[PDB]
Design a protein around this ligand. Structure first.
Ligand code: A0O
Ligand code: A0O
Ligand code: A0O
Ligand code: A0O
Lengths: 608, 102, 212, 63
């Protein structure tokens, strides 16, 4: 047992000559132990029992400038005993770290030279790492590289080691690990913005994709059910989703694996066909329904300025919902006008009064049906999930009112009033469309209500604070405390100015209340001009684009099926051999990038 | 500039008329009864506090709670207009009104 | 380095990682494990924590004469060590401090003019006032005796003691049978609502309502 | 700064055996025959790429 631990110690340092004579001793140990035929005896003297770590692992963990010599002795020692398969393709047996497979250690240590020696000796390059570390539950506990040595080479930015693993034979690029991912999911899962990551994930997305050459490995689904495009939308990875929707590839043998085709270019004027294969609400999932109908992520305003998205909101707005939302705004406005008229103002009823009551009864039931579905189908209540509730509340209280007339209760009158008063509250909820009404959203009005209530929380204290001193100079407090805030309203009192005890002290106490309240009132305007002005003007412009983008998608589900067949965005275009894709046309003019045009579909530039 | 200010005041009135009608229907229930009460509502902002309609037969503590929320929420909307003018109007028109004057 | 406020030379003490093998002991910010882009770093707290007589916390925080205290408190074994103390001590205690002082000033105005064998909720309410105000005079009486400074928090230790002593001085005047049992107790209650405004040092929304 | 005084003033208000229970940081063997009360801060760095030669615990697991 001393001989075992000296091997792990000498491997940990650069002790080359000590490691040789230990192997010369251990080979002499096998000559006296010929009876077991040494499969397991050679493993047991070079691998810890509980953790399963090998001596070949132990050298690659502790990188020293003698590491290149320690491994080539160990691999030559494994070759003499013909155990090189079990000695290289060995793995941990812990609860974590399951199958770490020392090839993945060398790839982690950024040692490409010792990497090639393992691969040439045979390292089983698709060796899946599992365990709770590499598949972490919390983000800081581990690192989710993608459970593949091919994945870790590109995820930890090692381009030359991406080349060595991929050009190997049995790499199996389209493998699925636990959680079901590809390599392309693992690159999408692990990315950030241009800060903190200088574009390596974008080009490691690229280099793996050209050598694949097919539509599997980007139309493959994980266990959740998503493609690497859809999973780039759900996690909110911004600049890796710019690369999917604008992946123009000018190489001739594989031009099919591309979006943003160029239809015709003439000098500085070029017509570019973006692609909408899964970037449009015509399937079950889409990149629109995953970006727009989502609250948990962040960052939705940045992904909605990407070009096959941002145009596709605008084309849907110009032909659907600039008509429908103005038609929605009128029918709900004529609804609340009709409520207050037939309530208290005005069998065989009057003809304009009967048709007006007919308009209310059918329409309010339609809101309870429509908003009753949207609640049942569905944190969220901060953005638009609360606004689906209140129209249903306004719908049900009108319906609950007339039901109380069937049960003959007194609350036919009072509950119908509360429905009408809440009805005018939701006409304020049609201010999500108007750009001038962006500063009257609820997000700003919540912050202002936060800043007024804390001012009242100051003011009530100074109302009580000075007021106790008012109660001493003469309920005596309940008379005096009413005089105090009505003084700010403008009720100056003369008889309580003429106090029996200390009239000059109460006059001094009155003038300090007027000044200190005028200090606190100025102290509120500093709080609003200092903080509220800058950040909300950044926030209320980003929440206005997003609240419109939900109303465009919600209206499209309100259209019938054969209306979406008529109203169709994009055209079919032959972008490759035997291929047809529904594609958006965006015409752009570029004057700085000058190049001859070799990647163009249509030779004749005419819009025909 | 005076068109932009008139745009920003009329949309504030378009908020204020709704909250004039919105709270006012709840005023009409606590007792034209609305046309008497809706005149009392904006004159309260002018400074006409009324004592007899404060003493309602039905729920005087509820109508007093309804009155104090109208004064606060109007004071919220009035502050919400000054944020709209200090946020947007200040920078762009000072670029625009100097270019339209030349 | 803490007492004189030298900033960037104190960044070097708390983040002195030394990768050389023969002397790695003379180091802080040890790296416990690194795996690719994810690394776990152990900073050191040998004298950077309130467990000895002096510390880098008691010299940075309890100090007014220097300058620059907000920059030294964003250094990493300091800034985390305030936050970990906040998450497990004083987000509970300062909210417990805010309620017991709020129920104190509510109880003062009720038993003063509004409302032997007294009433049972009135007797227990008066019992809560008598013991607690004496605790403030004991607690803030120490903090004045132990200790320019009055610009930051040394004045705020005074006023709670003033509110404590005037309630105690009031009931002592009832023993000497003076007329000022009534008037001085009122000035204690009015100054009592002034110090509930002095619990606005915690709330970030109440940062614009400070005294500065 | 005014919050940072209220955190330190409250810690002197705790009893002695409460600060023994509430303790920040753990003991870790950072060198030969050395033990220091140390705070753990996990950070993620993507720009500085280097092989790792200065590391205490070989097995990366939070155990
Ligand atoms: C009116 O069309 C819309 C609607 C909503 C959004 C929301 C996000 C966004 O950033 O862009 C949008 C557009 C595009 C506008 C123009 C003028 C091309
Ligand atoms: C276009 O019609 C609209 C417009 C707007 C809304 C607003 C909320 C809502 O829940 O329902 C709406 C409907 C559907 C009503 C009918 C009668 C089919
Ligand atoms: C709430 O914890 C505190 C408390 C006080 C201070 C004072 C100085 C400072 O700069 O940082 C502080 C933090 C850290 C906050 C976070 C969110 C890590
Ligand atoms: C947690 O208890 C608190 C909380 C806050 C304060 C505020 C100032 C102060 O001087 O004293 C305080 C005490 C101590 C009171 C007792 C009864 C031991």
């Amino acid at each position: 047992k001393r001989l075992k631990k000296r091997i792990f110690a000498a491997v940990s340092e650069g002790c080359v000559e000590e490691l040789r004579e230990l192997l010369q001793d251990l080979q002499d140990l096998c000559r006296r132990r010929r009876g077991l035929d040494v499969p397991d005896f050679l493993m047991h003297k070079l691998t810890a029992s509980d953790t399963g770590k090998t001596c070949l692992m132990k050298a690659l963990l502790n990188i020293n400038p003698n590491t290149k010599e320690i491994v080539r002795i160990l691999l030559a020692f494994a070759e003499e005993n013909d155990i090189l398969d079990r000695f290289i393709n060995a793995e941990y047996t812990e609860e974590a770290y399951e199958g770490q497979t020392a090839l993945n250690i060398a790839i982690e240590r950024r040692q490409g030279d010792i990497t090639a020696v393992l691969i040439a000796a045979g390292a089983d390059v698709n060796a899946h790492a599992k365990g709770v570390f590499f598949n972490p539950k919390y983000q800081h506990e581990g690192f989710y590289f993608g459970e593949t040595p091919l994945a870790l080479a590109a995820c930890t930015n090692q381009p030359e080691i991406v080349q060595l693993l991929m050009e190997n034979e049995q790499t199996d690029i389209t493998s699925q690990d636990s959680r079901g991912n590809n390599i392309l999911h693992a690159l999408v899962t692990v990315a950030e913005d241009f800060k903190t990551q200088n574009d390596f994930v974008k080009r490691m997305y690229d280099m793996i994709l050209l050598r694949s050459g097919n539509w599997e490995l980007e139309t493959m689904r994980n266990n959740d059910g998503l493609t690497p495009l859809q999973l780039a939308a759900k996690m909110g990875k911004a600049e890796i989703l710019k690369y999917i929707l604008s992946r123009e590839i000018k190489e001739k043998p594989l031009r099919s694996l591309s979006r943003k085709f160029t239809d015709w270019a003439y000098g500085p004027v070029s017509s570019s066909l973006y692609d909408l294969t899964n970037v449009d609400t015509t399937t079950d999932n889409s990149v629109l329904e995953i970006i727009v109908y989502n609250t948990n992520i962040d960052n939705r305003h940045e992904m909605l300025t990407l070009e096959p998205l941002h145009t596709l909101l605008h084309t849907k707005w110009k032909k659907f919902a600039k008509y429908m939302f103005f038609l929605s705004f009128c029918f709900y406005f004529f609804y609340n006008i009709t409520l207050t008229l037939v309530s208290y103002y005005r069998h065989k009823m009057s003809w304009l009064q009967l048709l007006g009551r007919m308009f209310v009864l059918i329409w309010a039931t339609c809101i309870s049906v429509k908003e009753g579905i949207a609640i049942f189908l569905l944190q969220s209540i901060l953005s638009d999930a609360w606004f689906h509730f209140v129209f249903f509340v306004q719908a049900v209280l009108v319906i609950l009112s007339v039901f109380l007339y069937l049960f003959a209760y007194k609350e036919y009158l009072a509950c119908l009033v509360l429905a009408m008063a809440l009805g005018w509250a939701n006409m304020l909820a049609y201010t999500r469309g108007f750009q001038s009404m962006g500063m009257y959203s609820v997000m700003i009005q919540k912050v202002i209500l936060h800043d007024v209530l804390k001012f009242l929380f100051v003011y009530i204290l100074f109302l009580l604070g000075f007021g106790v001193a008012l109660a001493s100079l003469i309920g005596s407090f309940s008379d005096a405390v009413l005089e105090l805030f009505k003084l700010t309203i403008g009720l100056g009192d003369l008889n309580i100015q003429q106090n029996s005890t200390y009239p000059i002290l109460f006059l001094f106490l009155l003038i300090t209340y007027v000044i200190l309240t005028f200090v606190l009132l100025l102290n509120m305007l500093i709080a609003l001009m200092g903080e509220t002005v800058e950040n909300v003007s950044k926030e209320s412009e980003r929440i206005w684009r997003l609240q419109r983008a939900r109303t465009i998608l919600e209206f499209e589900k309100m259209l019938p099926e054969w209306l979406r067949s008529r109203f169709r965005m994009g055209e079919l275009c032959k972008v490759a051999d035997e291929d047809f894709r529904l594609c958006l046309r965006i015409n752009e003019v570029k004057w700085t990038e000058w190049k001859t045009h070799v990647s163009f579909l249509n030779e004749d530039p005419g819009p025909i």
